[PDB]
Amino acid sequence: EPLSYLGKDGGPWEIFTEQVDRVVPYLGRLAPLAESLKRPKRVLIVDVPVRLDDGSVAYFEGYRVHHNTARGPAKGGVRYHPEVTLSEVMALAGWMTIKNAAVGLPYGGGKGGIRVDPRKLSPGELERLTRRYTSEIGILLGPDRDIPAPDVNTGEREMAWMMDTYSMNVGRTVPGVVTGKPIALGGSLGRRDATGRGVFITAAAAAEKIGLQVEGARVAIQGFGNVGNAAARAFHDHGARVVAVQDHTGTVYNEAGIDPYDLLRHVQEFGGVRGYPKAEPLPAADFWGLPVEFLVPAALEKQITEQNAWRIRARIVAEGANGPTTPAADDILLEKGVLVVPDVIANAGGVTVSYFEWVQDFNSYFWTEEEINARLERVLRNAFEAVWQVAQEKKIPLRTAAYVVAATRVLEARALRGLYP
Amino acid sequence: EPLSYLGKDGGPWEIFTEQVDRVVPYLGRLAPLAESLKRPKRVLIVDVPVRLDDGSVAYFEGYRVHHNTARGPAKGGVRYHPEVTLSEVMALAGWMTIKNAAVGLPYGGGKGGIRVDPRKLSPGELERLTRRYTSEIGILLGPDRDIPAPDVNTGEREMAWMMDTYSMNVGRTVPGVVTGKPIALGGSLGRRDATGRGVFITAAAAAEKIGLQVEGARVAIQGFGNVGNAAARAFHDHGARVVAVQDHTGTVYNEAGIDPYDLLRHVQEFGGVRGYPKAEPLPAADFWGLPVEFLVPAALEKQITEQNAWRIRARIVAEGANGPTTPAADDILLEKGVLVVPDVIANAGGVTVSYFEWVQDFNSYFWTEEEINARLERVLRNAFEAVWQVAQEKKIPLRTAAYVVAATRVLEARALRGLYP
Amino acid sequence: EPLSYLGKDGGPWEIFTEQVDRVVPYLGRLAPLAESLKRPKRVLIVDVPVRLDDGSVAYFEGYRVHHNTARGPAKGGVRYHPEVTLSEVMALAGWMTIKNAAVGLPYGGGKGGIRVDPRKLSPGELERLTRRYTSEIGILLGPDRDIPAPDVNTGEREMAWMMDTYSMNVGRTVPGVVTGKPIALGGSLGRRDATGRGVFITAAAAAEKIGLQVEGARVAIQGFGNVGNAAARAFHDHGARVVAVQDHTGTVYNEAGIDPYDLLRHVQEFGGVRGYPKAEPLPAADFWGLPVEFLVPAALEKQITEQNAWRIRARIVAEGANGPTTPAADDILLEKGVLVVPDVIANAGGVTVSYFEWVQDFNSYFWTEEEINARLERVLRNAFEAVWQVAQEKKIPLRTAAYVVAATRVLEARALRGLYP
Amino acid sequence: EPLSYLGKDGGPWEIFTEQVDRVVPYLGRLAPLAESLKRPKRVLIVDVPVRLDDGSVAYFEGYRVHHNTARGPAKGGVRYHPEVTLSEVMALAGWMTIKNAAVGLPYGGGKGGIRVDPRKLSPGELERLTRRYTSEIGILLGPDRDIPAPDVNTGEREMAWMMDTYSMNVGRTVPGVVTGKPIALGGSLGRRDATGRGVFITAAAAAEKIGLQVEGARVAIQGFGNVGNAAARAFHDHGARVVAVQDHTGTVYNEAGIDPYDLLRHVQEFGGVRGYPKAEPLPAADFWGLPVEFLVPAALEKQITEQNAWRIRARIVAEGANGPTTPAADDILLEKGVLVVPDVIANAGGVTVSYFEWVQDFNSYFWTEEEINARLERVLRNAFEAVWQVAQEKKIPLRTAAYVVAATRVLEARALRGLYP
């Protein structure tokens, strides 16, 4: 029986449950418990009424799903977008259960959304919306229950309002009720670069397993936003060189090496990578064929496909963006012997630092930049190592290994606790 | 914007929503606020895992909806049925908002359900399902927040289980967390005949508005279940003659009067109304056109239609069943000038006594049967008179007016309380 | 298996335990649940340190027991006596469960004790002892959890201290946390005469059942404290003739009848019955054999015995005292055809007015003396009626029947509720 | 002047209380406060009903005792054994107050027990038993109140179930509600070897004070389970010579020494020590009389007894077990000038790691094995240092000095906080 409240096509949720299906062969004694993964623990649909600037009331659909809770409080961001749907928010929570268990955070999986176009609202209106939403899901929330975070179209500003609103309602300041707060509000050092640095940490852990030296290595990187330039800087700081960067404006190439800091100025200065004087322009499609040690897809989804996977000369692909390589491209890349570090752990840097933020918030005692990076390495190098060991011991690719690890840990937590009530 | 999570399906929810649309022209300055009735305040969808008797785990869908909370805690029964759906549970909670506001109960509108065939579960499995569902909806529940009740395929037994579960969870005995409990557990006297008694009380109020004498009046009753037979008993006991009852098995007719206590012994033993010694059989289609003062449909829906409305010679129709008369049949009865006491207030006796149960539960001081009946009478005549009054002011029929009374009160609570947060 | 922490012997507990055993044959399908009655739900032993007037600290043993809580919160007094023991507090809690169920109060049974001789403490030390105890048992207290009352060597003064200690500790006025409070603090009117009035109400109900007229009737009364002189006032004010009163002095007798107010005036002067101008003296032994309609023992335990029970000529014995008759006396009175209204319900007026205090405390609305006495008649006539019905049903004496009604109500609440967790 | 609810012989508790007496002469100005240690603050006795696999209900005695709670929340294992009595749970809670204080953990003393033979139950019955128990003692539990742990016949499995029952009852993730959990649920690393390592760390501190060389020092060890083999391993890794080992199968002596890792996989194959190819057999009472520097009794209680203490020719006895020396055996070992590091600090490795578990659980941030170990040394060296100095300052044996430090720290806490309420 699929879930009756989704109707004939279950959409994004079906895609999630199919992946649980595919992981079932590798679960051993835990396999029967896998059924619990195909239904969310808790779905909460709330109305969120908002007095608009004219003084009239608008009504919005807000959601908060706790996909699974066996391993700890629900954790997962909150998205404002006109195309938000029950189905998607459930699926996304399902992915957070997987991601958080694969990287070894002490959390279950949760997500939230409000179906609204935030570009149609004033800053005032957005504030009132965040506040009402926070109040409405208040029965879910707590640093030991469910810790929202930023997602599509939300950030530090919204997170301050959730915090502030839960803290006023509840009668005390509780910084850890959300993460991705500003520093001033109990936020954490090292958030901005977390993800791009974690791509490097995980890429470099793979390189040691295959005896690839980092100091010599060449790097090509797609996307130069927060993740891309952070990855760029880390590779460049460890002795590697960035020989090409592609983004939405154009592509630039220089086998001798591009300076990430130098390029970045130009990126805000003009708008994109195009016209960087210390490199030559390159056609969109050739980027993928460059002889490199490291390729970092850190931009849009569906960028390494059946159409170009044969062109890839990289020894290691480290996934910065969510889902940059298609299932077809995986098969091709496995064939060509290229190591793919899956988005699941490769991009987990941000979620790890927000875990760090939750942690510092309990006794309001904040860590230095350097303790953040050191502890970020410990978490992600341990996640790469556990995913590597499973990939070897079961003869599956790293991506399949990541989902086996995740499911295995959630299902072990559940087997231990037992069924109660 | 209709609710996106329903999909282009309205179903039972769209029927509720259209009734709201139909009331808007009578709402005056409260009208803009009617939009709020077209979205439940909250929906909670839960997974209810249950260890079956065969050692395996089954997963059921549970729902608890709070449609509107403005006049009070959400109040409404819980249904166990394999056809239970999100949209159904929403719509029924919407009708609860409306029923409570028209009967004048200090409650909001709630509803719950499990998608399960209880026929297929043993008593043990049923217990374990009930406990886990009540644990799962724990966060909603409490005498001041949400009070479930029996509905389709649940009764005393399930209510005992819900009370004890929540009580054990919270380490206090909290009798008022559900209603329809057994007396031994803080139930209320008078509950069984309540709805039936209430059909009469409503028909009597109606009678007094048109100068119709109850002593010596003739009644015909379709349905001889808990509602039907208690309504007959009430009528008899206030001096009316029951002359015809139509059943499953047929119709019996006798102008001298049928003793309902005698007839009941027959329906209990023999199996149904057919073959009752002290009356003659009657052909089903002849029931509707009989010369009588009161007609009480207390059986299935859509029993009074275009096909038979013109034959009805009753001065008062009192709706014991939900939806026994079609809108077309309404228009006909209006044209003939027969008063229709609408199901919304007419069959509210059971709901009114559950409320008395919750009242009594707050200090565990229990009322006598007579006291229950007298306070029941107060509630139901207050409800009739309020509807009558709106019916006369706006020149609309009783049915419309009951819906107008409900909406006006809910929006009135909301207008005074205001928008917060 | 017997309770290990009591060891071999009992002793008050094994006595209660045996009464449970004797009731089992009459329990029907509830019989296998009766084992639960032979174990306290909860036993709390506290140390109560108290600063003495001389500046030193002393350490007293404190106890609170919840024998059974299937029917409602624990209810029972706190006793201060140097011979208080764990075993005794347990058995007394057992007797509270039975008592509350037999009279039909919505309460489980509890008891408390402190092992202290209160004659040797100053009022200042007794306040400090009371305040510390209530604190130590506070995890247990609350109007919906556990409601203490006065008992041996406690009264209004220390109930006022318990209420205050709990209230201050919890930050709210919670009058309903204990009963037996001063009326200035949310006590109930009608407390002084409750037990005596109850002895009458219950006697008169028995009289009805045997066609015995109260107006004609002669009454002998042992004891003339609160229970005895209120019983006497009640009997006289309903047209009965009080012909004999025995006190700690001696006995007075008058066939024409004694005015109990005039007697009471004479006792408040002379300190007891004796030389009462309007009655002749009688030797103590002639008292029990007086030809009367009603005999009321309202003094100490064990006053009706193998020694004097065979001499009784009364048609009705109505037990005002706690256990005034021995089991061997019950056997004798049974053969002689004398009706014994058992103490469990006969003396319950006090405990019922405490119930009323608690009920009134929920919303701080207090009833008139007229209302308390009407409501008290209702409780005790109902209690007597239920005991009567089981006595006839099962062909057993009233005493035994009271124990059966009690154990049935407890066990039925337990069966309905189920076993959880 | 003993507690009334234990009778004239209080067995275990009397022994604890007698031990408090003998400590009073060393307490200085805190000596009058010592009476407080002769009472348990709180004794809770629950009934724990379980549904058996055969459908019938069994009732078990459950206990939780808080001996003292001045220094912090209560801390102590829960034991399932058919010999568990109120007296014993009390004693063990008392020893826990001493132990926790002696090592400098921020905990008061507690202990639980169920009186049951767990070998008579199926794993399902053992679960339902565990969950009922944790429910019944619910009112006591919380990371800031009472934090249970494993003891006789309990382990990781029961703890998981306690964490789960409690977390579900309360609707929050609360890992720190018990310790000794699986790592997957918030357990700590380094729990397997903690006691073993502690025995060594604590034996070394004793050496570094009596001018004893660890290195070439010969070590005899009774018991080769978790405690024994980790002790041998750390003695070995620190240059020492494991010359003898005795578990249940026999004893294996070897002048030249035994490499424990080699001995381990031998016991992890043939069942015990008995058949070890790389040593000669010279058992059994011979083992005790061996000329050694370190004797580690790490098996059962009462092993070094008033009947075999004579043979002992070791310089330092380091107690890995609980109570491996009778008091008469202490006198003889004092006589021969042999150092006995008392079990109260010598085996406190496990309890320190439990403390670390609880610490890590507050923000769910988990320490490396290297960190656990450095932190465990820091704690156990400080404990010894404090115990040593008092043994010297007051010229008393190491065991008595630990008890004195323990009594002093508790009473100082009690004196600083003062008496209240």
Ligand SMILES: N[C@@H](CCC(=O)O)C(=O)O
């Ligand atoms: N006792 C929990 C297991 C943990 C979980 O699933 O979150 C349950 O039955 O659901």
Ligand SMILES: N[C@@H](CCC(=O)O)C(=O)O
């Ligand atoms: N939007 C991402 C990241 C949030 C974060 O920075 O913690 C999520 O839901 O997990």
Ligand SMILES: N[C@@H](CCC(=O)O)C(=O)O
């Ligand atoms: N099924 C009805 C029952 C009302 C009641 O008996 O309390 C409801 O849900 O409103």
Ligand SMILES: N[C@@H](CCC(=O)O)C(=O)O
């Ligand atoms: N403050 C409430 C009032 C209406 C209600 O309680 O439903 C709101 O804006 O939602």
Ligand SMILES: N[C@@H](CCC(=O)O)C(=O)O
């Ligand atoms: N000592 C009485 C209570 C006194 C009262 O409530 O009036 C009892 O425990 O039953």
Ligand SMILES: N[C@@H](CCC(=O)O)C(=O)O
């Ligand atoms: N659920 C309760 C029912 C009986 C009671 O409340 O005492 C139990 O298992 O013990």
Ligand SMILES: N[C@@H](CCC(=O)O)C(=O)O
């Ligand atoms: N069984 C020991 C140690 C438990 C632990 O490892 O923390 C106790 O109850 O104190």
Ligand SMILES: N[C@@H](CCC(=O)O)C(=O)O
């Ligand atoms: N105020 C506490 C201090 C000792 C403790 O906390 O146990 C008391 O009177 O007992």
Ligand SMILES: [N+]
């Ligand atoms: N993902």
Ligand SMILES: [N+]
């Ligand atoms: N009323």
